[PDB]
Ligand binder design. Sequence first.
Ligand SMILES: Cc1cc2nc3c(=O)[nH]c(=O)nc-3n(C[C@H](O)[C@H](O)[C@H](O)COP(=O)(O)OP(=O)(O)OC[C@H]3O[C@@H](n4cnc5c(N)ncnc54)[C@H](O)[C@@H]3O)c2cc1C
Ligand SMILES: [Cl-]
Length: 468
Amino acid sequence: TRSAVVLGGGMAGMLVSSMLARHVGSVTVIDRDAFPAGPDLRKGVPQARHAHILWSGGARIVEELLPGTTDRLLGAGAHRIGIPDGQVSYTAYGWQHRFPEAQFMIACSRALLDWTVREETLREERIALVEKTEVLALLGDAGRVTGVRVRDQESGEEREVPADLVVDTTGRGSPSKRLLAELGLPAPEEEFVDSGMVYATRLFRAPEAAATNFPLVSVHADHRAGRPGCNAVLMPIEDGRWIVTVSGTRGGEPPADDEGFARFARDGVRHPLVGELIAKAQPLTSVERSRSTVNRRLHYDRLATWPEGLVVLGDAVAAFNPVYGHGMSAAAHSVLALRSQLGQRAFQPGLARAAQRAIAVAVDDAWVLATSHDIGYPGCRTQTRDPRLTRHAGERQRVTDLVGLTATRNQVVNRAAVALNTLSAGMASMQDPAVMAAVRRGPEVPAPTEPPLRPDEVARLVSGAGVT
Ligand SMILES: Cc1cc2nc3c(=O)[nH]c(=O)nc-3n(C[C@H](O)[C@H](O)[C@H](O)COP(=O)(O)OP(=O)(O)OC[C@H]3O[C@@H](n4cnc5c(N)ncnc54)[C@H](O)[C@@H]3O)c2cc1C
Ligand SMILES: [Cl-]
């Protein structure tokens, strides 16, 4: 019984559809894109050309919604990389000592990740993906949404799709501001923090022996230094490839040309390690860029009027600077927030509003982590009323930096820091007495004086071929 319509069949739409099909009789997913039969790039998810880190916090929720997905990913060549044991990371505070595993991430092409999630979701026959279809309007009125009007691209025919619940998951380019204006609702408060960050990515074929068990390698900006923030990330993906994404804020953007890419990875960031490693590998693709890096949030949950039967989640409600790697995990937390409200309130009036407020809570940690570190870069453009960004940014940063510095050299602080950063634990967790006690106990290991690479990792950067 009951029907749901989901706008957008990307990550949030597939996760939310899988969840909803366990609560309603049918789910219809409307997407303007065409979908490949295999793990290919598609125009509706251009960000799949860039490195995607799936932190443990989101991975565990994906697993809860779509059992078997994590193993299916690893089974297809995705890498499980332990954090911090499997990462070689030059943080703002220095090299991270590679303590034993506290958390993990899943490393693969976003195209394979999307394909795996969609194929698993659509095994449920009561979920139908309706491709190459435009969303024209929300049906109903400002009091209650009752479906959507859509247009088949090939035919041109329009039709009404009824729904007891409409969920907008159309991503960063979502048209919900327009759709909700057409209903007669006031505009939501828009909040943004725009560092001017630009991404540049190439794919490489890794040296053959390093195609597995190779670490995630990252060189981070120093958010406290009054210079443009620049980063470089090397991440293993399936079938023996490396995806390498470099990034820079206003005044430090990476160039678009292949030769300037490798130069930036060496000299544009604070340590040349990623540039040194890509010199061991064979480039496979030319440079792809992206400017979709603004932290932007729409406060739908605080609107004076909200229609029954309408929920917005994923990048459509809150989108983040991708260098922090939280977007997919925030979407998953948001799907669970909607599920929690469905279990509590069924489809009573107040469900959609309660879900929208719960979704605002679900994305808040990712929002604070990204915005608190972006707000400081030169020339950052901001629009916010959040006193955590406007009043108490300094002492929050002094607490952040004390934790971040100590996490590089203290196993207990690192465990707490990565639990929060993978969105496996909430912000309050860091106020636990045991964590601040370990912070005060200070470093337990020396600061690494060189990249903490293992000999057996660097040994696999060469073949030994030209040697008798
Ligand atoms: C460069 C970059 C790097 C990133 N790296 C990471 C990372 O390392 N880790 C991480 O967790 N996240 C990362 N993200 C964020 C992640 O890509 C998004 O958070 C995630 O895709 C959000 O899913 P979504 O379903 O809300 O939107 P999307 O995945 O973008 O899906 C939106 C869907 O809606 C459809 N659609 C869009 N507009 C319309 C329309 N008008 N009508 C109909 N259908 C429409 C699209 O075709 C698509 O199918 C990165 C993002 C970028 C840009
Ligand atoms: Cl993009």
